[PDB]
Amino acid sequence: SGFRKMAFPSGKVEGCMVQVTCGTTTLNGLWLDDVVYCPRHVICTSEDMLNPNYEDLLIRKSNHNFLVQAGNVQLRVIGHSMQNCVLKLKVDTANPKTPKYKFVRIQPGQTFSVLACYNGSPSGVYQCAMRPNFTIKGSFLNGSCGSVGFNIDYDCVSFCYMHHMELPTGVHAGTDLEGNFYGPFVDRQTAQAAGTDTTITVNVLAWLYAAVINGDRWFLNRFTTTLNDFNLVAMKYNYEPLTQDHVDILGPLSAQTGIAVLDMCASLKELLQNGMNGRTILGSALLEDEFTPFDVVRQCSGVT
Amino acid sequence: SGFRKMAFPSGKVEGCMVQVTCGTTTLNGLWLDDVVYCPRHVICTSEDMLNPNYEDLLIRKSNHNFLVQAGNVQLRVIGHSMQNCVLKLKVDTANPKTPKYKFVRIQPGQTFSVLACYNGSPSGVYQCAMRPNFTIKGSFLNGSCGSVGFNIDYDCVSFCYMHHMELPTGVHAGTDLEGNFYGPFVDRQTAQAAGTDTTITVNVLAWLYAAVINGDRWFLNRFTTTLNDFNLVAMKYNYEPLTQDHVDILGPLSAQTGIAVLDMCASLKELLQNGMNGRTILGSALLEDEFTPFDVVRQCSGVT
Ligand SMILES: N#Cc1cccc(CC(=O)Nc2cccnc2)c1
Ligand SMILES: N#Cc1cccc(CC(=O)Nc2cccnc2)c1
Incomplete structure (x- = not known):
């Protein structure tokens, strides 16, 4: 429930979080194996950030200029390289807590x-x-x-x-x-x-399935729709277009609840057109889009 | 931001979560030092749950009937006692990860x-x-x-x-x-x-302060109120009464934003009476009450 x-x-x-300091800038790093990953802008002063040339700024840096601290102990930097916008700092110790x-x-x-x-x-x-x-x-x-x-x-x-x-x-x-x-x-x-x-339509539909599984059913209506009809309404409301791939991904939720995906789409279409009317779904007054179909299945089944 | x-x-x-099984019931336990805490209803069958006499049910249990597993290794139970609705299982090994x-x-x-x-x-x-x-x-x-x-x-x-x-x-x-x-x-x-x-009024006010700190200011009005006037409206909307202790606790947020607590109360009073009008505050269409004043300060200051 x-x-x-x-x-x-x-x-x-x-167990992977470390502190990386270069000069006067301090930020976080991720220590996996013997490498610490961090944003390359750790080498910048606030002035450098206006128009930085990272390759040029990096020439003035040596391994000893990067201070990496894991808990209250310092890691020894034995190499450094830039990969796109991250710096990879090779340290002499592999993280014992690397998952x-x-x-x-x-x-x-x-x-x-x-x-x-x-x-x-x-x-x-x-x-x-x-x-x-x-x-x-x-x-x-x-x-x-x-x-x-x-x-x-x-x-x-x-x-x-x-x-x-x-x-x-x-x-x-x-x-x-x-x-x-x-x-x-x-x-x-x-x-x-x-x-x-825009709103992530497939996630909103997954969350409407989660609401039905948890007892919130007031929004279920007597209508159905098609992908093309639903998408005309989705475009109007700045919702992402729903594809047959999204319908496929919602299959296990449709099977668990017995509500066809297009019927749930028609319920969503009416929620968009009529509003919530001061009502709530799963304690929310707007349609939530930060649960994927996989998240709904995982939470509703208890995957550890 | x-x-x-x-x-x-x-x-x-x-690092403290363990599995506790008694007969056919399996639930979670919390292992701190050499004690595992778990709900006492782990000793019940679904039939026993209708009208359980826990003291009587416990007489039929011995230390070896409680199976405690931490990861893929079994802990040895050397004692058991009931404290109110929890069972305390003494094990022969102190949890090495006890914080x-x-x-x-x-x-x-x-x-x-x-x-x-x-x-x-x-x-x-x-x-x-x-x-x-x-x-x-x-x-x-x-x-x-x-x-x-x-x-x-x-x-x-x-x-x-x-x-x-x-x-x-x-x-x-x-x-x-x-x-x-x-x-x-x-x-x-x-x-x-x-x-x-009922709604936790002091938490809603803390969250309105968080919204102002983060740029959502549309709801701020030109009014003020008193504790007694605000509370008449709070009673009507099933909000908890606000006390001078709650006003005191909101002091650091009032100081950071320059918005007197009673002025924020008057904004809340207008939100209750007029509704949101299809607008959102911090991405929510209803007033959030699960952030305390301390949580707002902690999140807005970066307490680690
Ligand atoms: N890449 C990059 C970058 C470019 C300019 C400036 C900054 C600094 C910056 O945005 N900090 C920050 C503050 C608050 C929250 N998250 C992050 C970073
Ligand atoms: N004390 C207690 C108690 C009494 C009767 C029945 C139960 C079982 C029960 O409520 N499980 C459960 C299911 C779903 C979510 N959380 C928990 C527990």
Whole structure:
């Protein structure tokens, strides 16, 4: 019973967080095996951020200029290299707490947990989604750069995000663990605007399935629709187009509840056109889109 | 930038989760030092739950009847005792991962993180609040009993909740770590109804302060009110009465934003009377009450 915005347990990632300092800049790093990953903007002064030439800035740095601290003990840096927008600092000690891991680049609409850190110390964990405009709506202050996003499949941590920047609108941008930004963003103190933050339709449908499984059924109607008809309404409401791939992914939820995917689409269409009328679904007054179909199945079945 | 429903990092609590089996019932336990704490209803069959006499049921149990497994290794039970609604199983090995800890009994309106577990294995972490009717709105399936609620102050874990039951309405009830239920609930398969789930006013005000700090200011109005006037409106909307103690606790947020507490109360009064008009605050279409004033300060300052 009940449906919560749930994050993965963070212990496996807590054992990987370190503090990286270069000059007067301190941010977080991720220590896996004998490598520490961190945003390359750790080498910048606030002045350098206006128009940085990272290759040029890096020439003035040596291994001893990168201070890596894991708990209250210093790690020895024996190598450093830049890969896209991340720095990889080779240390002489493999992290004894390195979990089984993979680096994955997620698609928009995919969710992940974030372990927000400051000075290499974890402060909190929350669940979020890669928005269709390639931003994330996180909770990050100065010093949170290098905090990471991840998913866990039993004992393997798939790292998908590393925090780099806050846009002038207060939304966040970052990279995968290969240092490639999600979206068109760059690590520069220049005004960068985000595109339309559309709603992740397949996630809203997954969450409507979660509501039916948990007893919230008031919104279920006597109508059905087609993919083309639904998508005309979705376009009008800045919802992402629903494809047959999305319908396929919702199959197990449709099977569990006995509600055909297109019937749930018709319920969603009426919610868009009529509003909630002061009612709530799963304690929310708006349609939630940061639960994927896989998250709904996992939470409703108790996958550990 | 940004404000998220954030849980404490769960690693310290993950290292304490064990599986406790008695006969055909399996639930979670919390292993601290050489004691494993778990709901006493682990000794019951589904038939015993209709009208259990726990003292009588316990006479038929011996130390060897309680199977405690930590990872893939079995712990030896050398003693067992019942304290209110929890069983304390003394084991021959102190948990090597025992963090610094305290057992606290929280007040309604207080928030905590929950590490939801199945078979002694963590599946997720979420943030919740002890409701004014002493229920929690969690996300728990069968097998989640023994999952715990906690707060962390730097390196000390204060355990405040242990999950025991799901009421017929799908809301949850549990105990503190001394085994005393929050509210009037009992560990019996009998219909128990919850009282009015009123809104935690001081938490809503804290969250309105968080919205102003993060740029959402549309709801700020040109009015002020008094505690007595505000409380007449709060009673009408099933909001908890606001006291001078609550105003005192909101002082640092009032100081940071320059918005007097009673002025924020007047904004809240207008939100209650006029509704949101299809607008959102911090991405929500309803007033959020599961952030305490301390949580807002912690998240907005980056306490690790
Ligand atoms: N890449 C990059 C980058 C470019 C310019 C400036 C900065 C600094 C920055 O955005 N910090 C920050 C504050 C608050 C939240 N999250 C992050 C980072
Ligand atoms: N004390 C107690 C108690 C009494 C009767 C029955 C039960 C079983 C029960 O409520 N499980 C459960 C399911 C789903 C979520 N959380 C928990 C527990």
